[model samples]
Target: RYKKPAKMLHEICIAESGASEEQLRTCLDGTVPTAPAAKCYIHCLFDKIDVVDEATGRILLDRLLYHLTRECSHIVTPDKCETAYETVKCYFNAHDEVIKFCHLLVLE
Candidate 1:
C-alpha cells in the first residue's frame, strides 16, 4: 500500500533487529516473534506508526487502528495486532504509575 514508508520500516527493522526479510514476512503470517530483538523490532515499528498528539501524547484508537489496517495488516495477523494495540491502550487507562511506565512505550 504505502510504498516508500513501508520499505523504510522494512529496512529499519532489518538494520535494527538483524531480522531478515523472510523472518519479518513470517511475522506477517501470524508468527509472533519470540526473540528479544524481534519483539523489540515489532514494538518499535508500532511505536513509530502510532499517531499520538504532540502536546498531550494521547492516542486516538480508532484512527490508529485504521492506519494499522491500511498499512500493516498484511504484515501481521488482525487479532494479534488488535490485541497488542488494545493492551497498550489498556495500559494507558491503568493507575498513574502504570500509565507513566507505559508512556515510555506509547509516547516515545
Candidate 2:
C-alpha cells in the first residue's frame, strides 16, 4: 500500500464528479446516496487507489473485498461508476465487521 494526503484524494474526485461535501455524507451512516455524481465520485476514488482498474475498468475482487470476499456478480456492474457505487452499497448495507478495513469504507 502507498500513502497520499487523504483529503486531497477525495477533493479530486469531488471536483470530477461535481459532488459536494454534504452529498457524500450519507456514507458516514453506512449508506450510498442515489445520485450519479456520487457514483462517479466513488468510482474515481477506487480508480485512483487501485481497488478498481482505471484502464480496463475492472474491479480487483481481492482488493475490492480485501477484508472478506463476497460474490461480486451481484454488485459489480459493467460501468466502473455504477460498480463502485454498488460495491459501497453492498459493503455498507451488508454491515459486516470492520467497515473501516477498506479504503473506500474509511473515507478519512
Candidate 3:
C-alpha cells in the first residue's frame, strides 16, 4: 500500500522481502530476481521523499542506481526489459532527479 508517483521506470510488481545490499543491487539491476525477502526502499523522487536528506539524496540515489546497474544487468536485455543498463547509466548521468523509489528502506 503506497502512493503512486510520476516518472517511475516500472510499476511496482509486488511487495518484496528484505535482503542484503548485494541482493538488493542484484534485483534492481535485473541480474537477480528480488526474492520473497525483498523489501521496499523509499526515496523522495517518487512519493516518500520525506525520509531522505534533501542535500545528498540525488548523489545517494545515483550511487545506489549505479550499483544496481552493475549487478543486475543479467536479467535485462534489449527487448522486453523495462529498464536497461543504458537507461540506468543515462539516469545516473543526466537525471539526478529521482524517478523510481523503493518502498523498502534498509542499509543492508
Candidate 4:
C-alpha cells in the first residue's frame, strides 16, 4: 500500500529505540508499555518519520504522497516512553494513518 525505500526507516527506529518486534506491534493498540523500550520505540518511529509533532500531539495527515501536512488536534504528555505512548494513545483514539503512513511508507 506504499512506495519502497521506506523500510529502512522502520528498521532504523527498531535499532535506535532498542525495541523488539513485539514492542513495535503493541504500538498498534493504545495500551501502556511493557517496558519503556516499547513506548519509546513508538516515539522513535514517529520521530523517524515526518507524521507527527510529538510535542504538540499533532498527527500530520499528509493525506497522500506529496500532499500537504494536514493534521488533527492537540495534546501534551512524560519522559520518552510515557510521552511517546501518550502521543500514540491520542492518535489511536482519532485513528488516522499515522502508523500506516509510516508503516506503508516502510511497511515490511
Candidate 5:
C-alpha cells in the first residue's frame, strides 16, 4: 500500500463592487470582450475550486472552457460555445481512433 498526504491549492478573487447581470451581460455582448477572456472571467466570478494534474485538468478545463464558448455564449460573449465545441469535435474526428477507443466516462 502507498501512503501519502493530500496536497492542495486554492485561488480567490473579490469583486468588491456590484455590476448588474445586465451590465455584466453588456460586457459580454456581441463583438465586445473576446470569447476566451469573457469565458475565463465568468469562471473567475463563479468557479470556487481548482484541481491539479495537467491531463485531467486539461480534460476538465477544456470541457468547461468549450462549454462556455459554446453553450454559454450569450452569458459571456458573442462566440457561440456550441460552435466552438463543434469545431473541436471536427478536430477530434481526426483522431477518431483514440476517441472511439477511449471511454471518456464510466458508470458508477
Candidate 6:
C-alpha cells in the first residue's frame, strides 16, 4: 500500500478541486462516492496524470496491482491488499463515464 502517493494524490485533488479529505477517503475506504463533487474529485486525480485516457489507465491499474501483489505480499495481509487493490481498481473503472459530468478541473 503506497499510502504516500495516495495522500499526495489526495492533496493535489483537494487543492485543484476543493475536495475534502472525507471525499477522497471514502474512495480509499472501500465506499465509492456517487456525489458529484466527490466523483469529480476522483476524476480530477486520474485526469491530472492523463490516466483517464483509456489504454494507459488500464496499464496503470494493471501495473499498480502487479506492484501491490509483489511488494505488499508479506508486509500486508492478502485480504487487506486485495481490498485496497479492488478499491483503487473500482475507482479506475468508475472514471470511464465520469469525465463528462466532472468537467475536469485543471490545475493552475
How does model 3 score by TM-score?
0.22
**What is the overall TM-score of model 2 with all chains considered together?**
0.66
What is the lDDT, from 0 to 100, of the residue 78 in candidate 2?
Answer: 78
For candidate 4, write residues 1-108 as lDDT tens digits.
235546666677778879777765643543444567766666676565665554565444442134122222243453655655665565455334554553563335
What is the C-alpha local distance difference test score of each model? 0.45, 0.64, 0.31, 0.55, 0.28, 0.44
The local distance difference test score of model 1 is 0.45
Clashing pairs in 1: 28-75
Top model by TM-score, which number? 2
lDDT by residue (tens digit), candidate 2, 27-72: 6654565678888987887777777655556566676544434545
Ranking by TM-score: 2, 4, 6, 1, 3, 5
Candidate 2 lDDT at 7 equals: 65
Q: 4 or 5, which is superior by lDDT?
A: 4
* Per-residue C-alpha lDDT of model 3 across residues 2-34, encoded as one tens digit per residue: 343322322232222233455444434323223
- Candidate 6, residue 58: the lDDT equals 30
Error of 4 at 102 (Å): 8.7
Task: Pull out the clashing pairs in model 6.
Answer: none
Tens digits of per-residue lDDT, candidate 5, 1-108, equal 011111111012213112233332433222222244333433332233332123322213344342243322222223333333333333333444223312221000
- Give all TM-scores, in the order shown: 0.42, 0.66, 0.22, 0.55, 0.21, 0.43
lDDT of model 4 at residue 89?
Answer: 60
The most accurate candidate by lDDT is: 2
Candidate RMSDs in order: 13.4, 4.2, 12.7, 5.4, 14.2, 12.4
Ten contiguous residues minimizing lDDT sum, candidate 6:
99-108
lDDT of 4: 0.55
Location of the lowest summed lDDT over 10 successive residues in candidate 1: 69-78
